[PDB]
UniProtKB/Swiss-Prot annotation, chain A:
<feature type="modified residue" description="N6-succinyllysine">
    <location>
        <position position="50"/>
    </location>
</feature>
<protein>
    <recommendedName>
        <fullName>Chaperonin GroEL</fullName>
    </recommendedName>
</protein>
<feature type="modified residue" description="N6-succinyllysine">
    <location>
        <position position="94"/>
    </location>
</feature>
<comment type="subunit">
    <text>Forms a cylinder of 14 subunits composed of two heptameric rings stacked back-to-back. Interacts with the co-chaperonin GroES. Can form asymmetrical complexes, composed of one GroEL and one GroES, and symmetrical complexes, formed between one GroEL and two GroES oligomers. The asymmetrical complex is the functional unit. It was suggested that the symmetric heterooligomer may represent a transient intermediate in the chaperonin protein folding cycle.</text>
</comment>
<comment type="function">
    <text>Also plays a role in coupling between replication of the F plasmid and cell division of the cell.</text>
</comment>
<comment type="similarity">
    <text>Belongs to the chaperonin (HSP60) family.</text>
</comment>
<comment type="function">
    <text>Together with its co-chaperonin GroES, plays an essential role in assisting protein folding. The GroEL-GroES system forms a nano-cage that allows encapsulation of the non-native substrate proteins and provides a physical environment optimized to promote and accelerate protein folding, probably by preventing aggregation and by entropically destabilizing folding intermediates.</text>
</comment>
Curated annotation (Swiss-Prot), chains B, C, D, E, F:
<dbReference type="GO" id="GO:0051085">
    <property type="term" value="P:chaperone cofactor-dependent protein refolding"/>
</dbReference>
<dbReference type="GO" id="GO:0046872">
    <property type="term" value="F:metal ion binding"/>
</dbReference>
<dbReference type="GO" id="GO:0009408">
    <property type="term" value="P:response to heat"/>
</dbReference>
<dbReference type="GO" id="GO:0006457">
    <property type="term" value="P:protein folding"/>
</dbReference>
<dbReference type="InterPro" id="IPR037124">
    <property type="entry name" value="Chaperonin_GroES_sf"/>
</dbReference>
<dbReference type="GO" id="GO:0005524">
    <property type="term" value="F:ATP binding"/>
</dbReference>
<dbReference type="GO" id="GO:0044183">
    <property type="term" value="F:protein folding chaperone"/>
</dbReference>
<protein>
    <recommendedName>
        <fullName>Co-chaperonin GroES</fullName>
    </recommendedName>
</protein>
<comment type="function">
    <text>Together with the chaperonin GroEL, plays an essential role in assisting protein folding. The GroEL-GroES system forms a nano-cage that allows encapsulation of the non-native substrate proteins and provides a physical environment optimized to promote and accelerate protein folding, probably by preventing aggregation and by entropically destabilizing folding intermediates. GroES binds to the apical surface of the GroEL ring, thereby capping the opening of the GroEL channel. Regulates the ATPase activity of GroEL.</text>
</comment>
Length: 150, 97, 97, 97, 97, 97, 75
């Protein structure tokens, strides 16, 4: 909201001259209004979208997005702060596609060992007593991480 | 018409609030903040305290100053423009060079 | 018949309120506001505070002044006209030629 | 473009906030506390109270001091960084060694 | 190694809180109460009020005193120990014999 | 040990509260009240105001006095007894003979 | 108001122009605003995505009405 502060992170990207993609619980008009004008004159090309859903649900799926793109998740809850984060902590992707109801990333740049490692930790998740519902949602993450969804 | 201050009173005008130059070339809009810089339009005769003579003010007309916007600061409209009225004590510093 | 103010009291009369000339040739209606400008009809002997003599007022009869309409400002009716009574401290500035 | 303080005003800058050395080896994150230590960037002429002369400030430029961050303390940003402005009275002590 | 207080400021350290010797043999638990007794670590130059001379403090270094723990009492950490900073006015009495 | 009050401080002890002999030869219950009478245990040097000398306290040690139990009255425990600490201004009168 | 603009912040040039307008108690009409065709068509071109919408019912009905007013007619 008034949580606009994070300028040095923002300008670092401006210095870079590259577009910025933002994933968080929510973004309010104060941040969006300035963002729109900054993008319009070509200072920065930046668009923001909302996280997957429920607190535990979105938080759980944030690490894979970051690791897949080689980025770092900002732990507000833990040892990290809004401003506290370098440009290098940001994830990188070839391009993204955004529409009114959907967000897509063509290809984040991350190491295969990290991609597989995310998948490897999933194996405990795969063989689960709960089975119904737990596996269905879980597999969807899995397919997105390295496979495909039909 | 113009204004003549009544000793120890200085009439100054406020400068731009949160000018869009913060953090670089970034345009920063006004989001609940006020400007403390001003220009001295008029100078009063001086302090009348302790009876012995009147002491002259340390600020000349046309100076650029930094001041504390407190209770001692009054607002009036002259020639349909906003001005500030405060004592010498309320002005914290002078911007020079 | 006329009135004689007592030391450190100044009798002034209020000028027109929200005169229709704001913004150029634009006519401004009354936004429930009141005029802060007046003329000095009478001058008191002076301030009798600190002890050393009596100090004369800095406002001469017939001056045009700007003042703060506070509690210290009282209203009286003389010769069926409205007048204001306030101390020297209340009058912030003088409008000159 | 530096800043010259006006008599009895001292310009200082705040040090690191809630440094993680409290309790022991343990590193304490900032819960929501603010640092009271600072460095004196500039020194004003002195206190002008009671007419006769001007009394000099007891703090030399470049000192490391401990102060009470009260209403009197004000914040301004010059050369794109944060500074604090307060009187001599607000500074409680000097750190020496 | 140590801190030098400014004039009219006295640095003292607080004594034991709700000491277990109340009523004689009986041990009294601490039920939300704080000790008012301290020791004077340092003495400032003295009061500088009303120009003429600087008046010396009535408290010696190393004295045991009783004081009013009000707003005027500040807390600092010296060599990882708790100290209190207050004026002469805040110290109510001296414990002797 | 014993206590030595600092200048303009008087240490006194409170007398019996709601003593039974009120309104005649009547034993009266302690419905809800306190005693304003005390004895002067110790005397401070005196008031230290306006520079020129220190004015001695009008009340000698061992006097029986009447006082106003206000904010200025503080309570401490000495040798397992309750005492009151207040200034000269607080004590209204002296009971004689 | 929401974005990079303010009440006062706006120059007379910002204001649009038209030959004349007709206003009554329940209706407002503009005879002809003066604007370029490229802007008129550009507004219409961006409408084509709006035209080809999955919802169809209600979405298209209101949408078409704007379209008719922008370059055609309403009967």
């Amino acid at each position: 909201s008034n949580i606009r502060e994070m300028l040095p992170v923002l300008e670092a990207v401006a210095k870079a001259g590259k577009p910025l993609l933002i994933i968080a619980e929510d973004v309010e008009g104060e941040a969006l209004a300035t963002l729109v004008v900054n993008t319009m004159r070509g200072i920065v090309k930046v668009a923001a979208v909302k996280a997957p859903g429920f607190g535990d649900r979105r938080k759980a799926m944030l690490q894979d997005i970051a690791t897949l793109t080689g980025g770092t998740v900002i732990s507000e809850e833990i040892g990290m702060e809004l401003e506290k984060a370098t440009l290098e902590d940001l994830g990188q992707a070839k391009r993204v596609v955004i529409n009114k109801d959907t967000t897509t990333i063509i290809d984040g740049v991350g190491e295969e060992a990290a991609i597989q490692g995310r998948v490897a930790q999933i194996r405990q998740q795969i063989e689960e007593a709960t089975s119904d519902y737990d596996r269905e949602k879980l597999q969807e993450r899995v397919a997105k991480l390295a496979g495909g969804v039909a | 018409m113009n204004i003549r201050p009544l000793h120890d009173r200085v009439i100054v005008k406020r400068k731009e609030v949160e000018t869009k130059s913060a953090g670089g070339i970034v345009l920063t809009g006004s989001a609940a903040a006020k400007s403390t810089r001003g220009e001295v339009l008029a100078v009063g005769n001086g302090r009348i305290l302790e009876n012995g003579e009147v002491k002259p003010l340390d600020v000349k007309v046309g100076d650029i100053v930094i001041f504390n916007d407190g209770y001692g600061v009054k607002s009036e409209k002259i020639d349909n423009e906003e001005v500030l009225i405060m004592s010498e004590s309320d002005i914290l510093a002078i911007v020079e060079a």
